[PDB]
Amino acid sequence: ERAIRTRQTILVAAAEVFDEVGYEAATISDVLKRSGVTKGALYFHFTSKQELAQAVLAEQVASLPRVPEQELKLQQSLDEALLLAHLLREGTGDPIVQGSVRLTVDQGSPRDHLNRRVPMQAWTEHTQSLFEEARAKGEILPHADVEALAKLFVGAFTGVQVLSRIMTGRADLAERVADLYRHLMPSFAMPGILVRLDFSPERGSRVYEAAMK
Amino acid sequence: IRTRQTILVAAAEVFDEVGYEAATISDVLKRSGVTKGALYFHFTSKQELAQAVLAEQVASLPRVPEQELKLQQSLDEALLLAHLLREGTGDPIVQGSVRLTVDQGSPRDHLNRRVPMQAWTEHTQSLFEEARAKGEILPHADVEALAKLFVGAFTGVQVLSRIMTGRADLAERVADLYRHLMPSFAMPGILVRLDFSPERGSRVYEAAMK
Amino acid sequence: IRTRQTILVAAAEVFDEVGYEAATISDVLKRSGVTKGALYFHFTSKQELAQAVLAEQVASLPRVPEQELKLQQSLDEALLLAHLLREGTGDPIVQGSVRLTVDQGSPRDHLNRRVPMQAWTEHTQSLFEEARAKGEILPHADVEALAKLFVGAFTGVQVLSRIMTGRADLAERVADLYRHLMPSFAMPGILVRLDFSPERGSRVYEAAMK
Amino acid sequence: ERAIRTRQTILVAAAEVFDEVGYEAATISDVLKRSGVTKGALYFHFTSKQELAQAVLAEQVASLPRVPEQELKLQQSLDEALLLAHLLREGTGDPIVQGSVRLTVDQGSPRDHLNRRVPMQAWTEHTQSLFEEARAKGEILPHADVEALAKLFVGAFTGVQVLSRIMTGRADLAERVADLYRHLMPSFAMPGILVRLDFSPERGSRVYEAAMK
Amino acid sequence: RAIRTRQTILVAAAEVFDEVGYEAATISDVLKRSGVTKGALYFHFTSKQELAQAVLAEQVASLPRVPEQELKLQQSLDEALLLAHLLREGTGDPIVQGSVRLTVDQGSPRDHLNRRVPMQAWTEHTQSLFEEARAKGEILPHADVEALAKLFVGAFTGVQVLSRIMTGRADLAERVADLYRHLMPSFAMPGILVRLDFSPERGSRVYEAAMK
Amino acid sequence: RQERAIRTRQTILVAAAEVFDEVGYEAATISDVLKRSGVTKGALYFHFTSKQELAQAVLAEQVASLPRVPEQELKLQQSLDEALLLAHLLREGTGDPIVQGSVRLTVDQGSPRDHLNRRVPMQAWTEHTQSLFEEARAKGEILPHADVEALAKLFVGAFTGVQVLSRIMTGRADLAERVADLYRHLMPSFAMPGILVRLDFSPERGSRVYEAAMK
Amino acid sequence: RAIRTRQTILVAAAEVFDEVGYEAATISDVLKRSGVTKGALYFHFTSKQELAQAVLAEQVASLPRVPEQELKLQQSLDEALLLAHLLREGTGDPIVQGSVRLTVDQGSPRDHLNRRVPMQAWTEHTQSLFEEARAKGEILPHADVEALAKLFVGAFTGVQVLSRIMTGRADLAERVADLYRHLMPSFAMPGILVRLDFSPERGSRVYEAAMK
Amino acid sequence: RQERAIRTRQTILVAAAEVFDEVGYEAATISDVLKRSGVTKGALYFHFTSKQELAQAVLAEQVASLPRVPEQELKLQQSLDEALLLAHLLREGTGDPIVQGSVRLTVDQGSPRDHLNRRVPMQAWTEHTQSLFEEARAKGEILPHADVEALAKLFVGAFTGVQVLSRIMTGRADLAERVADLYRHLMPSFAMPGILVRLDFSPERGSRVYEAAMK
DNA sequence: GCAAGATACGTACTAGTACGTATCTTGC
DNA sequence: GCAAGATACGTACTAGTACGTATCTTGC
């Protein structure tokens, strides 16, 4: 068990380094200094900065805390989005998801062998799973393209987050994520599921409080 | 005036290829073919260059054919921009300018990524108010938050497009984004009038090249 | 590809200002802002530069809006070209290219002034045959001699315009030249259809800038 | 009288130099060597290369031999044009008119103080005089712009000549000058004066023969 | 684990060499690019020379092949046409691009790289294929497989050089297909020649199958 | 002052070539070229302004002042002779140092630092090879609609590689054999009937053409 | 005849100086430009210095004036606004442009040009005008014509310098009119101030009349 | 390694300025700057890459590190003090060698050879002068719709000339008198009532401001 | 407190230029 | 045959670079 704890001490250190200076500018020593583990300690778990970065990308979907199982399936999606918004904002929520976001958004190069496809594909299928469930519980309009909507939400979320970083340091992210869902859902969500959805910041906070405890 | 454009174009292409922090003046010099001396007249630092390319995407990006249906103009703008980003030598400025704005970097690099975004946002809002007054969108829609939503929404659709299929699907992805965002604020029987078609998309590309 | 255009433009402006024989590579370097090295990739001699700018006035000069009345197209071409020559930064290539062709120099400078003229002549002839087949000019008109007459006629009208009122009157002088040459070969009731007006002249200027 | 002959020996030498290398490239020594006169011989008549060039421009209208006084005034214009065409072609006709043409067509610079306006203004008024006479002898249509036609002919002649130099070394100039007049005259010349005009090369040669003798 | 870190370094080395060439490259460049530790590097490779020699020793060894073919000459043709795609784009295989630069660049005898070793292996690999095709009855009776193998290896490398110089490798596929189209009439059995597929559209299909 | 200008210019060119061939473009210095040429600094800088200019000028001398082959009966033999002659010229410890330097300058890569035009010697090579094939087409020794342009790109292309591989394997020792191989295998795909057996691929001939063209 | 050849040389000298400045200029440049003989040149001027000094000694002397005015301050204003046009275009007067460069450029005391001489004359010329306007009752009682003349000469030269640097003399006319608009309220009699015409359209009309 | 970098950089800048002021841009050499600065070649080239870069950097130091005037009661007096202070600074056998070099570099012309940006020091001069006038407008010491921008171009413009003429006539000896003249005559055209008599145009003050700002 | 690195300064070259002298060309 | 000039070569610098060592910074 002393191996699985020290690997996470490495991964968080790498992600922390990657968040602040990007994949390019970061060195293996940067990650080594932050983690405060030995050269050989590192070498057991990760062979290279690439292998490090790929792993922090790989644990982006599994990293996000899952909310208590909601009765309305679209509300789960709404709550998850506003949780992720609160997680990125205050920071102290999660350290991996920040650097893993920056690793995915950063353009980089084909010469660096990062696979930004993995955290983005797996994120889309997860969003598709919820929308596929919500359809089985009859929450979405009869002829909606569940696949195109997953891609759209996964896209739009990334960019609403990008803008919110630039303009306000993510201070308004809650309001903007809420805005995205408040405007996107009238197109595919059943009317009446629309009146039943809880957009308020007061509710979304009471999910951030509950996820920690 | 002549060399500054040649420099800025070359700067954008280098910034697109390696990103701000990896890039050097040296690389921009070599890619521009201007003399050492010709560059320093205009730009002393790499920081000065990047800032200049960012403030350039305002007036470098080609304007759209004016229309009475202001939402179709807004739809054209984003579809044109979807093709500009796809190209390579369609516009070298926008591609580098995007990568400069989207990429995070550091506060240590003093680049103001806010002002291209400030411009992008103010422009889409100005067009939506010109759609509001002409009775195209619901009477009391939050125009400021909508434009902020459109800028943000596009940015991510673009990023997601870039990673997944080297920007190739961006035309369709922006079409979906506009189709799905519109019913939340468009007035009745306006969505049906709007032209989302790919063969119109490549047709507005011709009228912009001046 | 990028620098070659920047070089050629700068070469044309220097050639316009001082003429071929007075000009040096040194002057073109300084006016272009490209490195010594960047120029030699493309051009070893001053002769090589001039020849390149001459062969450029073929494809650099912007094309005219296609019309069913082929003589109106021919009239537009020469009126557009009358405004291109008047400017300064409208097109720097044509102005230098003209001065290079018109000026006499020497046989010692190996410049082939024939091939821009060969191009200019063949182009106006090709348009006149497209007017002949569409029944716009008298059935058996000497098309080869007419185009040669039009190229020659323009060249002098231009020179005379340049000397007398710094090219300012060229629009009117080319209008007169077309008005007076037309009845000798135009079919009945075609001269009356043709639009010579100055406010059309400035209007075709917009559609050419691409 | 030994002064007026030696001044023309200078002027022809200058014009000859100016024809072959233009105003710019030519030196005062170039003119001095060709003329074979002394430094002081030159200085009496001309102070500078500019003063030289201006003088050769100034004697362009007076230089052209005037044809025997024709009955048809437009035929005089036609014959004069085809004479000038023959004069430039064979060369041996006149040495001044070649260099004086090149001095006028060459763009030069505002920094050189040549006045290319003089040979061109005086050439236009002369063409206007003929067209003004032809009107008094009723050879031109009732509402023709005599001033615009002088400018047009003076222009078009310069450029028909320019093209003919580039393409054929002026070999076809006769045919091209003829062509210009054959196409320009239907617009302003009276019909019937048009049938009375002699365009043939055989006639125009018999003016070149006669002008020498 | 150790083959993992070796590969990471080799790929980075191959990139730097393809970028700046042997002389201009530093070991310092290769370190920053691999993203391994100083210690990790100096265990597998001591000097710049050893790095270069290793990438060279992997040219044939790490070249992605094809689906096994009925015609071993079409196997040969598809491999070559694949290499033309594998050399052009920003994504190919860095090992190939790297060693191709290392082999073709002259340098000097002052540097101690063995350029003959990748060349020998690539010639032998080509020969082996032509030998395999002789027993399967594809090539004609009195053919010199050695001399033909040397021809192909040589011809390809220069077809590839001209292409880089003139079109930045753009026309490489058309140049290679051209090469194989004129050379094979000399040694292929007629009946193989008409059953051969040089087509550009087939070249895309072998490239799409190479996403594996 | 023409004659002596040509003489010193050639000393510089031969010296530059030798330097380029032994260290390449980037490693070479003007310093190196001065030492070997024997010329003064101002003498060289009168003729060539930069290392690039020097290097370009040797690539120019690959085209011009390349030993002329005799006017042959068959245009293809004239092409075969030209290829095997160059093979001899790249081989020997002198032959031409200019052809050796040029090939190295053409085949090496160099950084995006340099502005050396490698397209130019290759274009002239291809245009000359095309011209020989087009003359062979009118004589009817090649197929009447064979792609004369695509073949020239093929020959220039392949030869360049045949040479490079030969340099690596045998220091260009076996070059002429390899070039003969190249031609023996490529010609049948576009040569007319009868024409192929008439050609003389022998090292017995390739050397007679060599010593004749040396004079 | 001799004043003819002197002028020809001086104008050419003034051009070269305006183009390359004093130090860069050669006498060789001035010869080729004047188009006179070596002998003709060396009779009037021996050295580059003597050439430069002569153009400088002609700054006021060869400056085209105006039609005589009712208001001597509007005479002053029109002259200054004329100079702004006479300095901008490719055609002005080369003597002005030349000497203005010669005066404003620093050089060194190592060269022996007297920059004070054109400056003295231009200051005296300005003073004389203001003195002429005092007796005609245009300027106010307790005004220092000397100090004002020095101000104007100084102010103009720098207004002219800034204009060259920022707009390549494009805005010089607007800058000079601006200068005269703010300075004159200090010394002009009110009643002259409202009768004064700074207008750009009038500036064109004085320039059109200067075609003589 | 910041502190010592600033120290050597300033030695180079002061030395460059001195050189530029005495021979101008074109005549000056890197050689000259090395000799006077005392610095090694590699030391200078670490900080400045070309003569242009040097010359630009001294024009940059005209703006920054120009002696600050005290926060005055009247914004126009603060402008009057700034002008007369610079007049003292251009005058004295030291004062600042940087302001002297900068002025010469700005006012000279140079060939189309050089790529020195003279617009930049002038723009900063004009923008600072405009800022002072705009603050004077809010305080209501100037006319409420006076063209604050056109005045800044006027002051920078005229001062530059007042100085140039002063250099020629009296080696800048009478500069402060001339500058006082300039201000006494220009201010009434845009100053509010009362404001003008409150201003202190005296050389009695201009020197008190000088020694205070020197410390 | 110190290992990594960033930064600052130093040395030894090579590249580039300005201007000087020599030597051929050429048009009478 | 030779004066003007164009051209070729020479000398003495200054500019620019590559790579070396020293010295500070900084994040644990």
Torsion angle (degrees, nearest 10) of CA E55, E61, E63, E68: 180
Q: Which of D152, D158, D167 sits opposite C177 (nearest CB)?
A: D152
Q: CA(F7)–C1'(I24) in Å? A: 15
Q: Cβ contacts (< 8 Å) between H113 and chain C: which residues?
A: 30
Stretch 111-170 of chain H: residues touching chain G, C-beta under 8 Å: 111, 118-119, 122-123, 150-151, 153-154, 156-169
The type of residue at A62 is: A
- Measured between CA atoms, the residue of chain C closest to residue D144 is C180
Is residue H198 within a helix (H) or strand (E), and if so which, with residue range? helix H195-198
Gaps in chain A with C–N over 2.5 Å, residue before each = none
The radius of gyration of chain F from alpha carbons, rounded to an integer in Å, stands at: 19
Nearest Cα residue in chain B from H119: B41
Measured distance CA(H170)–CA(H178) in Å, rounded: 11
In terms of DSSP H, where are the helices of H48-174?
51-63, 75-91, 97-107, 119-138, 148-170
| C-alpha span between F54 and F34 (Å, rounded) | 12
Closest CA to A32 of A17, A50, A22: A17
Which protein residue lies nearest to nucleotide I28, measured between its Cα and the C1' atom?
D33
Best interface-test mutation with A: which of B104, B125, B196 has the largest number of A CBs within 10 A?
Answer: B104
CA-closest candidate to residue F177, choices F198, F207, F149: F207
What is the experimental method? X-ray
Q: Is the dihedral of CA F23, F27, F28, F32 positive or negative?
A: negative
d(CA G154, CA G173): 16
Q: Residues A9, A35: contact at Cβ < 8 Å?
A: yes
Q: A158 with B161: CB under 8 angstroms?
A: no
| C-beta separation of H125 from H159 below 8 A | no
For nucleotide I9, give the residue with the nearest CA to its C1'. H43
Q: How many Å does it take to go from CA D43 to C1' I7?
A: 71
Nucleotide nearest to F12 (CA to C1'): J9
Q: Which two tokens stand for residue G45?
A: 């001027």
Sign, CA dihedral B108-B111-B113-B115, equals positive
> If DSSP codes are grouped into helix, strand and coil, which group holds residue B186?
strand
| Of H146, H129, H130, the residue nearest H192 (C-alpha) | H146
Read off the tokens for G75.
Answer: 């005479």
Overall resolution, Å: 3.1
Q: State whether residue D189 is helix, strand or coil.
A: strand
Distance (Å) from the C-alpha of residue B38 to the closest C-alpha of chain C? 6
Q: Which of A169, A23, A166, A43 is nearest to A107 (CA)?
A: A23
Q: Does residue B34 contact residue C29 with C-beta atoms inside 8 Å?
A: no
Which residues sit opposite H191 in a β-bridge? Answer: H142
Q: How many domains does chain D have?
A: 1
Contact G4, D47 (CB under 8 A): yes
Q: Which residues neighbour F105 within 8 Å (Cβ) at sequence distance 6 or greater?
A: F20, F24, F25, F55, F58, F59, F116, F118
Nearest CA in chain C to B62: C210
G34-49 per-residue burial string, b: 16 or more CB within 10 A, e: under 16: bbbbeebbeebbeebe
Which DSSP letter does residue C138 get?
-
Q: At what angle do helices F119-138 and F51-63 cross, to 10 degrees?
A: 10
Q: Which two tokens stand for residue A186?
A: 């009238």
User: How many Å from the CA of G18 to C1' of I21?
Assistant: 31
G117 CB-contact burial (10 Å; exposed 0-12 / middle 13-18 / buried 19+) = middle
CA dihedral C73, C78, C82, C83 (to 10 degrees): 20
| Contact residues on chain B for C38, CB-CB shorter than 8 A | 33
A99 and A16 in contact (C-beta within 8 Å)? yes
Cβ pair B185, B153 in contact under 8 A: no
Nearest partner of F77 among F23, F18, F142, F125, judged by Cα: F142
Through-space separation of residue A20 CA and nucleotide J27 C1' in angstroms: 14
- The tally of CA atoms less than 13 A away on the side-chain side of residue C81 is 24
Main-chain dihedrals φ then ψ at residue A173, nearest 5 degrees = -55, -40
Q: What are the backbone angles phi and psi of residue D140, rounded to the nearest 5°?
A: -115, 150
Tell me if residue F142 falls in helix, strand or coil. strand
D76 neighbors D191 (Cβ within 8 angstroms): no
Which of A87-125 are b and which e, b meaning 16 or more Cβ less than 10 Å from the residue's Cβ?
Answer: bbbeeebbbbbbbbbbbbbbbbeebbbbebeebbeebbe
Nucleotide nearest residue H40, measured CA to C1': I10
Give contacts of F123 with chain E, Cβ < 8 Å: 166
Separation in Å, CA H200 to CA A37, D15, H203: 70, 70, 9
Residue with tokens 């290679």: E176
Closest to E10 in 3D by CA, of E110, E70, E93, E112: E93
Write out the H or E segment, with its range, that includes residue F138.
helix F119-138
Concatenated DSSP letters of F69-123: PP--SSHHHHHHHHHHHHHHHHHSSSS-HHHHHHHHHHHS---TT-----HHHHH
As a three-state string, the secondary structure of chain G is CHHHHHHHHHHHHHHHHHHHHHHHCCHHHHHHHHCCCHHHHHHHCCCHHHHHHHHHCCCCCCCCCCCCCCCHHHHHHHHHHHHHHHHHCCCCCHHHHHHHHHHHCCCCCCCCCCCHHHHHHHHHHHHHHHHHHHHCCCECCCCCHHHHHHHHHHHHHHHHHHHHHHHCCCCHHHHHHHHHHHHHHHCECCCCCCCCCCCHHHHHHHHHHCCC
To the nearest whole angstrom, how far is the Cα of B210 from the nearest Cα of chain C? 4
C-alpha span between H124 and E201 (Å, rounded): 62
* DSSP output for D102-141: HHHHS---SSS---THHHHHHHHHHHHHHHHHHHHTT-B-
Question: What is the SS3 assignment for D25?
Answer: helix
Alpha helix positions (H), chain B: 2-18, 25-32, 36-40, 46-54, 70-84, 92-102, 114-132, 143-165, 170-181, 198-208
Using CA atoms, how far residue B7 sits from B14, B44, B48, B87, in Å, is: 11, 13, 12, 20
E57 close to E44: Cβ distance less than 8 angstroms: no
Whether H contacts G, i.e. 3 or more CB pairs less than 8 A apart, is yes
DSSP assigned state of B178: H
Could you write out the DSSP letters of every residue in chain A? Answer: -HHHHHHHHHHHHHHHHHHHHHHHH--HHHHHHHH---HHHHHHH-SSHHHHHHHHHHTSTTTSPPPP--SSHHHHHHHHHHHHHHHHHHSTT-SHHHHHHHHHHS---SSS---THHHHHHHHHHHHHHHHHHHHTT-B-TT--HHHHHHHHHHHHHHHHHHHHHHHTTTTHHHHHHHHHHHHGGGTBPTTTTTT----HHHHHHHHHHHH-
CA-nearest residue to C206 within chain B is B210
* Residues with Cβ within 8 Å of residue E161, at least 6 apart in sequence: E104, F107, F157, F160, F161, F164
Q: Which tokens sit at E116?
A: 């003959």
Pair F160, E179: CB distance under 8 Å: no
User: Residue D185 sits in which domain range?
Assistant: 3-213
Map residue D36 onto helix, strand or coil: coil
C-alpha B123, offset from chain centre: 11
Residues D11 and D56: beta-carbon distance below 8 Å: yes
Beta carbons within 8 Å of C23's beta carbon, 6+ residues apart: C14, C15, C46
Q: Within chain C, what is the greatest distance between any pair of CA atoms?
A: 60
DSSP string computed for B24-35 = -HHHHHHHH-B-
Let me know if chains G and D touch, i.e. at least 3 Cβ pairs under 8 angstroms.
Answer: yes
Contact D90/C at CB under 8 A: no
Paired tokens of B48 = 């000065």
Cα separation of C142 and B96, whole Å?
A: 56
Collapse the DSSP code of F191 into the 3-class scheme (helix H, G, I; strand E, B; otherwise coil) and give the result. strand
The answer to whether the beta carbons of residues A66 and A19 sit under 8 Å apart is: no
Q: Give the separation between CA E26 and CA E13, rounded to whole angstroms.
A: 10
End-to-end CA distance of chain B: 18
Residue B137 has φ and ψ, to the nearest 5°, of -125, 150
* Alpha carbon distances (Å) from H14 to F151, H38, H98: 67, 11, 6
Euclidean distance between CA atoms D151 and D154, whole angstroms? 5
3-state secondary structure of B137: strand
d(CA G11, CA G54): 10
